[PDB]
């Protein structure tokens, strides 16, 4: 093994994990579950030269996806459909901030 030169992680979109919390489905009670518990999303990441610049999305897209709200009732559960808004980044740039 040779220690290669480190390469900067460029400012660009990369796949991350987004948690579909119950909070975003119903913040009033806790009598349910949501499935799946997490999904993938594209998000700007990487770094810039300085702190006077920041890696920020140049274009974002909000899209609806269907999740399952699972309420239980006597050993049998109640399945229900629910839509959650996912945000993806399509492109980025180091933005002077």
């Amino acid at each position: 093994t040779i220690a290669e030169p480190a390469m900067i992680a460029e400012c660009k979109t990369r796949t991350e994990v987004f948690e579909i919390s119950r909070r975003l489905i119903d913040r009033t009670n806790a009598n349910f579950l949501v499935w799946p518990p997490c999904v993938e999303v594209q998000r700007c990441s990487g770094c810039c030269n300085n702190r006077n610049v920041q890696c920020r999305p140049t274009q974002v897209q909000l899209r609806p996806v269907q999740v399952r709200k699972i309420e239980i009732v006597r050993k049998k559960p109640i399945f229900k459909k629910a839509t959650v808004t996912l945000e993806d980044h399509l492109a980025c740039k180091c933005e002077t901030v």
């Binding site: 909070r23 009033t28 009670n29 009598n31 699972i70 239980i72």
Partner: protein, 273 residues
């Protein structure tokens, strides 16, 4: 009640077949909870019968066929229509998720059309086959961990993988409520924040009973999860601009519908001028 002949039938593709079923009282068949094209007929000797012709046999037909007693005791037949253009009998998405209230035997309902097919059970991303017994009529039955599984078979000469199933065992236990408040004595026009915390159950119901409830705009509680392994679910009740009368009994009644364990803790909060 009787049928010709029973109990398990293996039919050829696109071929034809007739199933009969008679009993002293009226009779009817039902495939998938809904009765298909039948032909009921009453015998002069006080005998009712029912027949249903299965034309153009296709794998998708493979399944349970019953014979009841209408316009808990019946006779079920299982029919296999070996169709090489059909891998695993497609099934509902509600079937793909297996939620459980306790530790018990489980069945992964992945079924084939040909009784002579070798079906193996695997973890979604796993190659080795699992030592679980298979019943071509019901699938794999055994004990599992909360993971995802798929079945595999060799139709023709190509390996086929059914959908993925997900085991999920709910988190249940005894219920104990722990109520508190930022301060049981608040001044007029200030904030009334109470926090009802319960740990052990995943899905619990929260019900707040208080003074400013009946005949008056109620409050919306806000739940939150502390930890996720040993479920620490917290429900807080916040009342900004504390008017009077708010002084009184604030009780948080927590119940889990999985079973039905209940519990309730109350505190008294006074408001001073």
């Amino acid at each position: 009640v009787v049928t010709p002949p029973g109990p398990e039938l293996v039919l050829n593709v696109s071929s034809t077949f007739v199933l009969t079923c008679s009993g002293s009282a009226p009779v009817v068949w039902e495939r998938m909870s809904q009765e298909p094209p039948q032909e009921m007929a009453k015998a002069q000797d006080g005998t009712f019968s029912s027949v249903l012709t299965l034309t153009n046999l296709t794998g998708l037909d493979t399944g349970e066929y019953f014979c009841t007693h209408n316009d808990d005791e019946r006779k079920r037949l299982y029919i296999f229509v070996p169709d090489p253009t059909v891998g695993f009998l497609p099934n509902d998405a509600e079937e793909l998720f297996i939620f459980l209230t306790e530790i018990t035997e489980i069945t992964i309902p992945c079924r084939v059309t040909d009784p002579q097919l070798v079906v193996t059970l695997h973890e979604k991303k796993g190659d080795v086959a699992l030592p679980v017994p298979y019943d071509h009529q019901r699938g794999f039955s055994g004990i599992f961990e909360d993971r995802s599984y798929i079945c595999k078979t060799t139709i023709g000469d190509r390996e086929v993988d059914s959908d993925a199933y997900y085991v999920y065992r709910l988190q249940v236990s005894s219920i104990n409520v722990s109520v508190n408040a930022v301060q049981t004595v608040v001044r007029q026009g200030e904030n009334i924040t109470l926090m009802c915390i319960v740990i052990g159950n995943e899905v619990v119901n929260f019900e707040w009973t208080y003074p400013r409830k009946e005949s008056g705009r109620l409050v919306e509680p806000v739940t939150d999860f502390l930890l996720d392994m040993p479920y620490h679910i917290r429900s807080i009740l916040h009342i900004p601009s504390a008017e009077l009368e708010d002084s009184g009994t604030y009780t948080c009644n927590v119940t889990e519908s999985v079973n039905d364990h209940q519990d309730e803790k109350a505190i008294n909060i006074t408001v001073v001028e």
